[PDB]
Clavaminate synthase-like protein
Amino acid sequence: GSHMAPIAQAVTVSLNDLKNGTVSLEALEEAFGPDSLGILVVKDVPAEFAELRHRLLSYSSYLGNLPKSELDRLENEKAKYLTGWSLGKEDNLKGSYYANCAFYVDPSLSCAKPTEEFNPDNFPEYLSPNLWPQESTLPGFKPTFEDLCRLIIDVAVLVARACDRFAEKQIAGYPAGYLEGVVKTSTTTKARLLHYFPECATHLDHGCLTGLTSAMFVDEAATPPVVNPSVNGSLPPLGELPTSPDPKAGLYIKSRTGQTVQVKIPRDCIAFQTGEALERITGGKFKAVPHFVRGARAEMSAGRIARNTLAVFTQPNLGDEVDMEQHITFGEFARGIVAKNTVS
Ligand SMILES: [Fe+3]
């Protein structure tokens, strides 16, 4: 279509090269550096990814369609609704399900552990325990969620390792392996499962690396997102439309030309966007790049089309330094602190 935005190709690397340390650092800088789109697509992902993505994005629909009484049990106002379920608006009504990924570090953790300055009362949005649906209500939800997040974070750790290789060659005084260690040991990383119910300005991501699946569009009239009480076993996946109902749906990124470009994530791949904490850790050698996500227009969506998405926001622990020069930690950074121990 002549009215479409320009399509751009995201830099794409193989998981095999991330695993073996052979990934091109020039490709990495083209993906994440000052002239870049701030996004890297990873192909050759583990064999289980496609089915785990299909299942968890289906669970987003199952979860969003539960009776309101069931969803009310998952709301967590003291956590600023950044744990558990919430209804939000953008006229785009959306259900959000948030969980911290401390279980990545230790399967026994329901959340991070507090520190002298970081107690769960002044950082409840990072440190509150997860609020999981009843196992009988959404059978298999929690293990599917954990397994997919673990897969995506495993890959994020390898992307962070490549970032470290770059930073170690390019930045004097850089701590060896810093980003890898930060991502791999973070108990503040947060996953978000979004459900856009059937019926823009840019931002920067805040953390280190946001792992992304391609969105799932589902006709909920054709495959009702209903937990059949007569059917046993983990919930089967729903249908997924082979193509978006609206060609304009997807990720838009402000490019170096001044064009706002559309970027598509292959359904069988994982993408990673840089955030502000990674930009600061690398002294601006890598950049968080402004972007936004567009859904499908209602008038283009035949039937009862829902959109489900997953993002895994890897970010530092609250006490991890993000500005290595001024010694500003991620928790300070997140409270809008921009200077530290400036003399009085
Ligand atoms: Fe974003």
Summary: The domain at 7-334 is CATH 2.60.120.330 (Jelly Rolls).
